[PDB]
Design a protein around this ligand. Sequence first.
Ligand SMILES: [Cl-]
Lengths: 317, 141
Amino acid sequence: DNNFYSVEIGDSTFTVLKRYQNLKPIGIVCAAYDAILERNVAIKKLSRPFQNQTHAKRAYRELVLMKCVNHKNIIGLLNVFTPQKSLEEFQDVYIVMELMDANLCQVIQMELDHERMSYLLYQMLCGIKHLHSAGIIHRDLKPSNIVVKSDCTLKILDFGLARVTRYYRAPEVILGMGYKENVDIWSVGCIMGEMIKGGVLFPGTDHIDQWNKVIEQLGTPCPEFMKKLQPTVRTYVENRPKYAGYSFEKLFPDVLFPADSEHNKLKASQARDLLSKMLVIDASKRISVDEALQHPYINVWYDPSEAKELIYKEVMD
Amino acid sequence: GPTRILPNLYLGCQRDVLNKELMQQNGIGYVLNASNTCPKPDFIPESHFLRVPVNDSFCEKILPWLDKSVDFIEKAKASNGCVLVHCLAGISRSATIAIAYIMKRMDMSLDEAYRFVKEKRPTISPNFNFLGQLLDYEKKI
Ligand SMILES: [Cl-]
C-alpha cells in the first residue's frame, strides 16, 4: 500500500496510509479510524529509531516480538509501515494496533469490585504466562503499559526489557541479583496492591527510596537472604536500619476493599493471601504465575471445557 | 542545565557538556567524564579533562578511581576553575563521584552526603553496587 498522507498532530507530523482516518492524539500515539476495518485503531510512531545503538535493539525486539507473538491479553498488531520509499530514505516506523479505551492507571482509579479486580489480575497473569511460555520475561510491568477495554478486557502493550517509573520492579532488579520468571509476579503484586489500597505501594524517586518503602512495609529480609547478595550490594543493604514490617492483615485490612460485596470477608482474605504470596522479597519463596492462576482468588476464571537494514527489513514483511 | 553542588562544582549529563552555550554561561572550565562512551566536548583542553572509564552496572568498580577523582576536582578548584562532573545522564555514575567528593571534603557520611546532593539534584539514583562501594570509601576516609 502506497497511499500516504500527512497530518500535523500536536508537535509531530504523522504520515500514514489513507485508510487511517481522522487522527486524534492520545512514543507518540494517536487514535484513528481504519476505514477498511471499520474500527478505531492506535498508531504509534517510531521516529529515527536507529537514532542510536539502543533505540535500535529495543525497537527491533519489540518489532519482532510483536509480529511473532499473539494472545488475547497482549495487544494485537494490525499493521506495520514506513512512509518512506527506500532504505536511504528510511526514517520512521509506524505500528498500528488495536485501540483500547483506557490505561490501567485510569482504571485503578475507578470503583472496582472484587470481581473486576480478580478479572484484571487473571488476564494479567495469562498474558504473562503466555510470555514466559515463549521465553519472554517482561521485567517492566506497570499500570501505564497495560490498557483495558470498556467491558474490562485487558491487554499488555509491550514486551518489556532487553535480555523513571521504578515502583513496580522486583527487589532482584534493585539488588542486582539474577532473576527468573516470577520476577513479573512481584509487579503483579504491586499492581494488585495498588488496586486495593488506592495508591502506589512503594513510591520512590530512586533506589534508596524504593528499597525503603519496601522494607518499611514488608520488613527487613532475613540474614539468609542478605547472604545471597554480591558483597557490595550486601554491605549497602545490611547497613540500612532494620524494620519489623507489618502483617498482611495490617497492610490490607477489610476496610480497603469495596464495602458491600457479597462474601467480602472471604474475598478479602483470599486477596490478602494471594498478596502475601506475591509481595515476597526472596524470589525463591515467591509464588509462580502458575500457582497464582490456581489461587482461589483467581481460579474462578478457569474454564475446564475450553482450550537498521534489519529494521527496515522487518518493516517490509 | 547542570546542577551546582558547590561553588566551582557542577553535576550534569552529557547533553550538558555538549551544550556550548550553557557551558559558557556557567564557566565550565573542567570536565570529569565518568563514561566510556560520552565524548569530550570539542571545547575542553585535554589537560583540563579526565575520563573515569566506567559503566553504569552492578559489576563495575568505581572505588579505585575515587582518590584520582577527588584530586582532579581539588586540583581544578586550586587553579580557581569550575568543574563539571558528568556521565550520560548524571543519575548514577557521576552522582557517585560527586557524593564521594562531598563525603571527603565536608566530612560527611554516605547518608548525609547523598542527602546533600539529592536535595540539589533530585533525579539522582545511583545503583546499590556504587552505594556499597561508597560505604567502603567512607571507611578509608
Ligand atoms: Cl548514568
